[PDB]
Amino acid sequence: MKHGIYYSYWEHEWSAKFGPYIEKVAKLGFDIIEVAAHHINEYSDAELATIRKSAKDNGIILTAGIGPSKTKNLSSEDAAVRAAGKAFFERTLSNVAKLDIHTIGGALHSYWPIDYSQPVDKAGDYARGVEGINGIADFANDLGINLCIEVLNRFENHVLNTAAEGVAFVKDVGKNNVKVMLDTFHMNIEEDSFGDAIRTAGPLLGHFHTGESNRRVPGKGRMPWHEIGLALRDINYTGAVIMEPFVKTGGTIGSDIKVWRDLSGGADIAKMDEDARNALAFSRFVLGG
Amino acid sequence: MKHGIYYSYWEHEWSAKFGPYIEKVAKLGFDIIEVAAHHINEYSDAELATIRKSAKDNGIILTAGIGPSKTKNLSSEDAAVRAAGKAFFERTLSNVAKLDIHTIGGALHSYWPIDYSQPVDKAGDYARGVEGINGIADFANDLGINLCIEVLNRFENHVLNTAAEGVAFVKDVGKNNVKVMLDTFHMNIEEDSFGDAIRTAGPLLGHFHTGESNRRVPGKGRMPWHEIGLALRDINYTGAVIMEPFVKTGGTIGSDIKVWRDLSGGADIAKMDEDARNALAFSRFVLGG
Amino acid sequence: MKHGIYYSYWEHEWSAKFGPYIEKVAKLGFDIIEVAAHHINEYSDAELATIRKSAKDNGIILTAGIGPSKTKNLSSEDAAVRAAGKAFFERTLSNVAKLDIHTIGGALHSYWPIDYSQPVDKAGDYARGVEGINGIADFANDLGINLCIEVLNRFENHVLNTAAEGVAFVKDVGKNNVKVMLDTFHMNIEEDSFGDAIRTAGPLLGHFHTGESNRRVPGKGRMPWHEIGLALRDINYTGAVIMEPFVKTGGTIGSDIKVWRDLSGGADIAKMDEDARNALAFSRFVLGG
Amino acid sequence: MKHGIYYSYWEHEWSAKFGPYIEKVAKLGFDIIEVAAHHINEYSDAELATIRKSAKDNGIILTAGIGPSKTKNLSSEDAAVRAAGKAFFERTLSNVAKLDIHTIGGALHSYWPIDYSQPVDKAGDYARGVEGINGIADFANDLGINLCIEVLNRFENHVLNTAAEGVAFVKDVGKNNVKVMLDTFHMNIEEDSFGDAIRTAGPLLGHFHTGESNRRVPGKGRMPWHEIGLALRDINYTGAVIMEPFVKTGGTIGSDIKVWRDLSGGADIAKMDEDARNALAFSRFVLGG
């Protein structure tokens, strides 16, 4: 079981480049650094070479998250959008492989952030989503990549909200490299039980995100970490545990994650790194590995 | 300390009339039935008189909720909207008084649902909301009505997300009949601690909403009820404790509250009542009253 | 899944007869009333049939708890004592069957109270305990009785302190009608996790005791009832859930259970019954049944 | 706020010399090492000075725990025992002062381990304990030592089992250098709420002991660490937080603490050290320091 952090924790814009963070994160002690995959597409093969090398040199693994856009996704009833989504995913999957990344996670079956101004079609999105993910599974698999379908709360997704729904969705896809993904922030809202949600995912759990109920780093809040660690161990989980804290207001990140107030205690960068380091030590000790 | 339930618990649409629930809810054992304040505005004086007498004859109190619309919100940058908002409230409070209602709660400082498609101005909406609520406090006061400002999670309000922020707002208002209102559903997401949140509201807590993290009736989930009851008693809360369960998909209520899966276990009305009745017994036993 | 209560909740002495309690408890709404075997050996075959009749008439099931004495225990190093123990057990079991009782629980593998003034022989006591219980299993099974071995905290027993140890012991016994028994008060001290302890017992869980960490009626405290309820349902527990609260000081019970302060809140019999009725409602709602 | 550990963690006898641990514990990162006042009165003035200098050179603070014997306690009915007890405390206090220890804690009001072999007199022992502590308070105060009265579970003490009882005791003593002492292991059994208990102790909280419900190092279990940390902060606790784990079977320690099974995971010293070190980082991060 390896631990990582989403570099966006230190930024305010989703577009900020992660290159510099590879070494920073490694020095903080993390086994993994999770990055935003759409960025991977704007880099030349040489720049990607730098990155892959920077990671191996600093002894750290990269993992990526993907938030499909409304115009390029797999669940849309609009066939052109679905085609754009398929074309976009295959390209990204290819570039992700250049960085030796083997896990892609996020709302891959849909798009994020979701737009509720217009009515929503859950059954239809569910059905198209399954076809869509099934359609790119082999491609990802050939690049040795797992596609992890993240379960989100009602405000961020209307198709998969509980581990049970995520598991059903993964079984319909019927691919060995497609897995369920849970996030404590989301479970805290939707799940009847943390331990049960994790046990429900079981062998299908392929990626894991952590944070307190208001997205502070692990260890700051009332989350049932002890129960969480026990259940992760019950299902012999050896995948990644990525903390995804969002404690700074402002920018596209602040409005997209809806961080309306500062939750870092007005922390400077040194304090940010400290909380991360402490959260890491906390997660290793309470969760495992 | 008195217990009540939001009648829309039994409905799929906001447009369902509450009149018939007066006796139903009273016979289930509740002390209060909470009702939507917009519905009151659609009744004739005679129907209102009928309703007022029905509540009286059934030994049950009426409490009300208000969700200002984008067209009537006291915090809008557009002075015209603010004026409409003021007119809307005065009108509503008058009608609310015809039913002998002394408690109005909800996001009175803003609008709901909210639209995050346009940038948000927190400091601006905050300042405007304070003046706007201050501006209608006396009017409401002359009617014997307390205005309880509800603290909501980040996905439903961008100004007041915490008990601390709620207290600060009520203070800047500086009115005796303007209070803070907390809701376990919202607290569960935003607060560092349930107990500290309730203690932080203290003498200012004027209204209270309950439900599990996914909105089922109190007692079905992992909410820290023991801790919540101890804190409510610790601040000597003698206000209302209103369970606000939303376990049914479909309808306007389903889409607005984002109930994308059935959380009632396929409950018929009889099951619905039993759950409400058991949650009621639970709440009296664990929370007080 | 059925609910009961240990009648001594109302007494101060172990030597209090439970006959009158059959109707009182049935009328309070419990499906079961747990009684003390100590007494059962005293009543005549005639008085016994009267009790059996009273329970059938009030439609209530009886369950029994046994606290073997140090002069009559199956784990004794002394062979004379082990023989008295087996004789004491067959005799008791014969009488228990006259009351139509099918479940006996307690520290059947040892003796209670217990005496730590002398050195302890853990391995020896565990070993004889297995042989001893194995020695009487069939006799009990012929009578349709399950022997539930209760796991207790370190202050009350030195052999079986966890569900894992309880299960290990039940397996070394190798009898179908010998089961493991858990008690929330004891789990609260020794277990790493309530849910895991219950899952560890799984199919072997034959009887269950409930109470808050300090022995008040369930629902009065911080016990993880929601968690306990999920685990019980996960393992399809359909056995009995007996609350065993001890909130009164004085008498032998006060001394043996170490109730050094009142925890009833100066409750008179009527209050004691209200608390019992509420804890029952609570247990049925949160735990199931 | 400072952190420490009871050296007995690595031992099996209350009579193991602690001098060598001064350096080890300091190297592990602790601010404090808690010592047993067992030996102390047998060390020569020279030895004590060596120990004191060792603490200085290693920059660590010393604290002491005491367990009065049945023959030298202050609550005894026999006037001779109370006299020997007072003589014992003055002697111990003087030598503790030579090691520059300013905090003494334990069941100072009575004796440990308690013996329930014979009947118990709670009111009497209470009254005598109050006078006995009041009686040695000034002697301790001249040395600049605070006497912290430990609240223990029912199995270990019959007089003070609650934070409220301990606070009532300390008030009757009416001495500025006699405070209340809480221990999470003991609180886990007797208290209604961890936070309320800590809040109740308030400004009288002088010392604090930590461990999981079954006595493992802090962070290994389900203790409500977050709630506990918020409470200590609520009361501005700047005292010491001493983890007191007992995870090894065997010896006098093993039988007095009733450790009937290994809870260290068969840990060799290096692992014992890693666990302590990890519980330390954990405690500093969750509780503060």
Ligand SMILES: O=C(CO)[C@@H](O)[C@H](O)[C@H](O)CO
């Ligand atoms: O949990 C979250 C935000 O709610 C992220 O994991 C997000 O889903 C990803 O960055 C894009 O899908």
Ligand SMILES: O=C(CO)[C@@H](O)[C@H](O)[C@H](O)CO
């Ligand atoms: O908690 C909620 C729903 O999120 C309600 O109390 C709502 O805010 C009110 O009905 C309008 O303001």
Ligand SMILES: O=C(CO)[C@@H](O)[C@H](O)[C@H](O)CO
């Ligand atoms: O839990 C308890 C008391 O600690 C009882 O169930 C007891 O064990 C039984 O009455 C005799 O074995």
Ligand SMILES: O=C(CO)[C@@H](O)[C@H](O)[C@H](O)CO
């Ligand atoms: O809590 C404990 C063990 O139960 C210790 O602090 C003990 O009380 C002390 O060593 C003597 O009083």
Ligand SMILES: [Mn+2]
């Ligand atoms: Mn996530």
Ligand SMILES: [Mn+2]
């Ligand atoms: Mn609400």
Ligand SMILES: [Mn+2]
């Ligand atoms: Mn029991």
Ligand SMILES: [Mn+2]
């Ligand atoms: Mn202690």
